Design an enzyme around this catalytic site. Structure first.
Site, PDB file in Angstrom:
ATOM      1  N   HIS A  84       0.812  -1.229   0.000  1.00 18.35           N
ATOM      2  CA  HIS A  84       0.000   0.000   0.000  1.00 18.35           C
ATOM      3  C   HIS A  84       0.846   1.280   0.000  1.00 18.35           C
ATOM      4  CE1 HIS A  84       0.149  -0.306   4.520  1.00 18.35           C
ATOM      5  NE2 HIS A  84       0.170   1.012   4.421  1.00 18.35           N
ATOM      6  N   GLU A 115      19.216   7.669   7.959  1.00 22.69           N
ATOM      7  CA  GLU A 115      18.500   8.806   8.537  1.00 22.69           C
ATOM      8  C   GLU A 115      18.303   8.650  10.037  1.00 22.69           C
ATOM      9  OE1 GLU A 115      17.425  11.673   7.554  1.00 22.69           O
ATOM     10  OE2 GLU A 115      17.105  11.639   5.384  1.00 22.69           O
ATOM     11  N   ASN A 134      17.183  12.187  12.097  1.00 25.08           N
ATOM     12  CA  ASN A 134      16.257  13.312  12.012  1.00 25.08           C
ATOM     13  C   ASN A 134      15.832  13.515  10.556  1.00 25.08           C
ATOM     14  OD1 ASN A 134      14.990  15.870  11.913  1.00 25.08           O
ATOM     15  ND2 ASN A 134      16.145  16.602  13.701  1.00 25.08           N
ATOM     16  N   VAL A 144      16.050  17.270   9.177  1.00 32.53           N
ATOM     17  CA  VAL A 144      17.305  18.025   9.195  1.00 32.53           C
ATOM     18  C   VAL A 144      18.393  17.289   8.413  1.00 32.53           C
ATOM     19  CG1 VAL A 144      19.157  18.993  10.660  1.00 32.53           C
ATOM     20  CG2 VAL A 144      16.757  19.148  11.403  1.00 32.53           C
ATOM     21  N   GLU A 184      23.698  10.999   5.381  1.00 31.75           N
ATOM     22  CA  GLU A 184      22.623  10.204   4.782  1.00 31.75           C
ATOM     23  C   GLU A 184      22.994   9.784   3.361  1.00 31.75           C
ATOM     24  OE1 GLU A 184      22.334  13.412   5.918  1.00 31.75           O
ATOM     25  OE2 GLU A 184      20.405  13.737   6.922  1.00 31.75           O
ATOM     26  N   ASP A 222       0.350  -7.854   1.764  1.00 32.72           N
ATOM     27  CA  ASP A 222       0.757  -6.448   1.781  1.00 32.72           C
ATOM     28  C   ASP A 222       2.284  -6.357   1.894  1.00 32.72           C
ATOM     29  OD1 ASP A 222       0.639  -3.660   1.817  1.00 32.72           O
ATOM     30  OD2 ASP A 222      -0.160  -3.521   3.851  1.00 32.72           O
ATOM     31  N   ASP A 233       1.884   1.086  20.213  1.00 38.71           N
ATOM     32  CA  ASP A 233       1.519   0.602  18.875  1.00 38.71           C
ATOM     33  C   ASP A 233       2.307   1.335  17.780  1.00 38.71           C
ATOM     34  OD1 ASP A 233       0.065  -0.902  16.968  1.00 38.71           O
ATOM     35  OD2 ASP A 233      -1.877  -0.073  17.579  1.00 38.71           O
ATOM     36  N   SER A 234       2.236   0.812  16.556  1.00 41.03           N
ATOM     37  CA  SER A 234       2.654   1.563  15.373  1.00 41.03           C
ATOM     38  C   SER A 234       1.471   2.402  14.873  1.00 41.03           C
ATOM     39  CB  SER A 234       3.154   0.618  14.279  1.00 41.03           C
ATOM     40  OG  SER A 234       2.160  -0.327  13.928  1.00 41.03           O
ATOM     41  N   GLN A 277       0.123   5.860  11.788  1.00 36.45           N
ATOM     42  CA  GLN A 277       0.266   6.448  10.443  1.00 36.45           C
ATOM     43  C   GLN A 277       1.662   7.039  10.229  1.00 36.45           C
ATOM     44  OE1 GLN A 277      -3.270   4.884  10.369  1.00 36.45           O
ATOM     45  NE2 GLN A 277      -2.900   6.433  11.959  1.00 36.45           N
ATOM     46  N   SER A 319       3.961   2.594   8.306  1.00 36.13           N
ATOM     47  CA  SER A 319       3.734   1.551   7.291  1.00 36.13           C
ATOM     48  C   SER A 319       4.969   1.226   6.477  1.00 36.13           C
ATOM     49  CB  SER A 319       2.624   1.953   6.326  1.00 36.13           C
ATOM     50  OG  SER A 319       1.357   1.556   6.820  1.00 36.13           O
ATOM     51  N   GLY A 320       5.158  -0.063   6.205  1.00 40.55           N
ATOM     52  CA  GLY A 320       6.293  -0.545   5.415  1.00 40.55           C
ATOM     53  C   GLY A 320       7.531  -0.815   6.247  1.00 40.55           C
TER      54      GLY A 320
END
Lengths: 61, 223
Positions: free
Chosen positions: B40, B52, B54, B57, B62, B84, B171-172, B174, B177-178
């Site tokens: 999704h 990564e 932050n 910033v 990175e 998924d 919990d996880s 929004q 995801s992924g």
């Protein structure tokens, strides 16, 4: 002319845990409003831009 | 991540951010040129951000690498969220170091009660807007299949598991995801879905990675 029925639909984040910035018409405040959509199972009250929301559902408050 | 803690810079070196002009999903580096994420989270022109901490910033250490291919599982169903899972090929292989490292795939599925590490840059509250700058972490146990199905009647497939806390608060959410669920140094889960975040009797639901190891191997071998 009456607006589309989608303006009366509730905000629906859905079950997915993505971060998808969208807009919905809030039928309580009467304004198109930003929200974070999860990425799946949304309804019609879900727009990619503020103008797209407003074109369908004009401000009442 | 709701109810977790600040991981600490680069303590989760397999965690990546998927970027479309902004962070929209997480992912896990599984080898130098491939990332595992949720189906999704499919987008075109994804930029993968590695090393990564932050996300808001520019540190200087990175790596930004464009996706060359994004392949969702052929049996992915956006209505039920069965299968998924998605593989992202990087345009070039990532430079491996103390901040950018691959996580191993499991040979067997993990058992109920196993403590795992779940991470991401998702919402840290169960309502409103509380998005972190730095990577957040949560220790959470795998829940029994029976309790998962009781929490979500008719919604849990053989390719999903629940992890977290039935009492709520942790919990996880929004933006997660992924992202990874790692148990005993193996990628066992992908952040997928739930009824809200950190709600009572509504634990997070996760893609069961052990079911996809063979598919992952062949996909890499044919792309």
């Amino acid at each position: 002319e009456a607006e589309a029925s989608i303006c009366s639909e509730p905000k629906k984040v859905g079950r997915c845990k993505g971060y998808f910035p969208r807009f919905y018409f809030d039928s309580e405040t009467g304004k198109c409003t930003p929200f974070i959509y999860g990425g799946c199972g949304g309804n019609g009250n879900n727009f990619e831009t503020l103008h797209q929301c407003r074109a369908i559902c004009r401000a009442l408050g | 991540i709701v109810g977790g803690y600040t991981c600490g810079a680069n303590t989760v070196p397999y965690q990546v951010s998927l970027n479309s002009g902004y962070h929209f999903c997480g992912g896990s580096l599984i080898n130098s040129q491939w990332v595992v994420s949720a189906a999704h989270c499919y987008k075109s022109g994804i930029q993968v951000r590695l090393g990564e901490d932050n996300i808001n910033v520019v540190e200087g250490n990175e790596q930004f690498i464009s996706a060359s291919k994004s392949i969702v599982h052929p049996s992915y169903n956006s209505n039920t969220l069965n299968n998924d899972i998605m593989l992202i090929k990087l345009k070039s292989a990532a430079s491996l170091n103390s901040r950018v490292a691959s996580i191993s795939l499991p040979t067997s599925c993990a058992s109920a009660g196993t403590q795992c590490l779940i991470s991401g840059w998702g919402n840290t509250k169960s309502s409103g807007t509380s998005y972190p700058d730095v990577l957040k972490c949560l220790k959470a146990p795998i829940l029994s299949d029976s309790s998962c199905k009781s929490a979500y009647p008719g919604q849990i497939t053989s390719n999903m598991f629940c992890a977290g806390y039935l009492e709520g608060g942790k919990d996880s959410c929004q933006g997660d995801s992924g992202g990874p669920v790692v148990c005993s140094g193996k990628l066992q889960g992908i952040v997928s879905w739930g009824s809200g975040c950190a709600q009572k009797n509504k634990p997070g639901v996760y893609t069961k990675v052990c079911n996809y190891v063979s598919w992952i191997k062949q996909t890499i071998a044919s792309n």
